[PDB]
Write an enzyme that holds these catalytic residues in place. Sequence first.
Site, short mmCIF file in Angstrom:
data_model
loop_
_atom_site.label_atom_id
_atom_site.label_comp_id
_atom_site.label_asym_id
_atom_site.label_seq_id
_atom_site.Cartn_x
_atom_site.Cartn_y
_atom_site.Cartn_z
N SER A 1 35.40 48.11 46.10
CA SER A 1 34.04 47.30 46.58
C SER A 1 33.63 47.64 47.98
CB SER A 1 34.37 45.67 46.39
OG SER A 1 34.80 45.27 45.07
N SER B 1 31.37 39.69 46.52
CA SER B 1 31.89 41.16 45.96
C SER B 1 31.59 40.96 44.38
CB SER B 1 33.37 41.35 46.21
OG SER B 1 33.67 42.78 46.01
N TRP C 1 39.10 45.91 47.10
CA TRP C 1 40.25 45.95 46.35
C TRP C 1 40.21 46.39 45.21
CZ3 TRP C 1 43.26 40.40 46.07
CH2 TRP C 1 44.52 40.54 45.39
N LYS D 1 29.97 49.13 47.61
CA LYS D 1 28.50 48.08 47.58
C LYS D 1 27.98 48.44 48.75
CE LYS D 1 30.44 44.40 44.82
NZ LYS D 1 31.45 45.01 44.23
N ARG E 1 43.70 40.81 54.05
CA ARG E 1 43.23 42.13 54.70
C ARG E 1 42.19 41.61 55.88
NH1 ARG E 1 39.74 43.06 49.33
NH2 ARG E 1 39.58 40.70 49.63
B1 LIG Z 1 36.17 44.76 44.76
O1 LIG Z 1 37.13 45.79 45.31
O2 LIG Z 1 36.12 43.36 45.67
C1 LIG Z 1 36.17 44.47 43.27
C2 LIG Z 1 36.73 45.25 42.32
C3 LIG Z 1 37.06 45.02 41.20
C4 LIG Z 1 36.94 43.68 40.54
S1 LIG Z 1 37.06 43.37 38.99
O3 LIG Z 1 38.41 44.00 38.57
O4 LIG Z 1 37.45 41.92 38.98
N1 LIG Z 1 35.98 43.68 37.89
C5 LIG Z 1 35.31 43.14 37.01
C6 LIG Z 1 34.95 44.43 36.29
C7 LIG Z 1 35.70 45.09 37.39
C8 LIG Z 1 36.54 42.64 41.37
C9 LIG Z 1 36.25 43.17 42.75
O1 LIG Z 2 37.39 40.41 47.38
S1 LIG Z 2 37.90 40.36 46.19
O2 LIG Z 2 38.27 41.37 45.40
C1 LIG Z 2 38.97 38.96 46.31
C2 LIG Z 2 39.93 39.08 45.10
C3 LIG Z 2 40.72 37.96 45.11
C4 LIG Z 2 40.72 37.03 46.02
B1 LIG Z 2 41.76 36.03 46.03
O3 LIG Z 2 41.90 34.93 44.71
O4 LIG Z 2 42.88 35.61 47.09
C5 LIG Z 2 39.85 37.10 47.19
C6 LIG Z 2 39.08 38.01 47.06
N1 LIG Z 2 36.83 39.50 45.24
C7 LIG Z 2 36.81 39.67 43.82
C8 LIG Z 2 35.93 38.34 44.13
C9 LIG Z 2 36.12 38.64 45.58
#
Ligand SMILES: *[B]([O])([O])C1=[C][C]=C(S(=O)(=O)N2[C][C][C]2)[C]=[C]1
Ligand SMILES: O=S(=O)(c1ccc(B(O)O)cc1)N1CCC1
Length: 245
Positions: free
Chosen positions: A51, A98, A191, A54, A231
């Site tokens: 992400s 995100s 992530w 983005k 993070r």
């Molecule tokens: B990002 O790195 O914050 C991010 C990447 C991937 C996803 S995901 O795996 O939930 N997704 C829905 C389709 C790919 C969430 C955040």
């Molecule tokens: O930055 S993320 O990857 C992310 C993913 C998981 C958490 B968690 O539940 O501790 C927080 C942020 N993201 C997906 C939605 C926001």
Amino acid sequence: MHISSQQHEKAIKSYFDEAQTQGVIIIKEGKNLSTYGNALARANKEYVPASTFKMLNALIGLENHKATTNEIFKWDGKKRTYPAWEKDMTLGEAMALSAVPVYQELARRTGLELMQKEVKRVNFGNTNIGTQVDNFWLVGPLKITPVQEVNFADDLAHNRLPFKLETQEEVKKMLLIKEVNGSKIYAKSGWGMGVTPQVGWLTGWVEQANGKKIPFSLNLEMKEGMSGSIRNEITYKSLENLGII
Ligand SMILES: *[B]([O])([O])C1=[C][C]=C(S(=O)(=O)N2[C][C][C]2)[C]=[C]1
Ligand SMILES: O=S(=O)(c1ccc(B(O)O)cc1)N1CCC1
């Protein structure tokens, strides 16, 4: 000041050790890159941007009139991986959450041909997006090093990317995540959930009260049942230890 570099290095290493992961945080002051953490060799290894992409996705979309900053991307009404994505939002709101689906819509509007040309033109990471316009930043083939990510952040913070000044300012406005005693932190988390091992990122800069901008990139391994906020926590502790905030 009077704290030894040995003590700073040990403290920052301990933040990664205590989160039970392996990682690096790269700090750039002017032209000088400093590498800290508990796994320094990660600094020039390639990982998916996840992400963090983005930031560039938004620059490309706004520059090429694929969206505006006030446009509301409607939720299609289908179930999402996260419940907070089940709503209508702007690019800025999607940046903070995100919200992958919004940025996938933006990538599709941009299209593969234009996306590849723009990613080459900016010379981001290994510059390869392959054939799938809506997931190339998530599962490969696009990859980038932590050194490359901190240099990208440096470029954006100082408006040096090859986009209009207005475009860069619009995206920078979307990235404010914390204010600490007159310092502002601009950053985007990442992530990589669809790769093994999973990569975690936090890439951005500190804008100090006096106007100086200090870019950084944290890179670490995300492990089973870690919170996303580790993070942020490691990053703030590290920047605080160095006196940057
Ligand atoms: B990002 O790195 O914050 C991010 C990447 C991937 C996803 S995901 O795996 O939930 N997704 C829905 C389709 C790919 C969430 C955040
Ligand atoms: O930055 S993320 O990857 C992310 C993913 C998981 C958490 B968690 O539940 O501790 C927080 C942020 N993201 C997906 C939605 C926001």
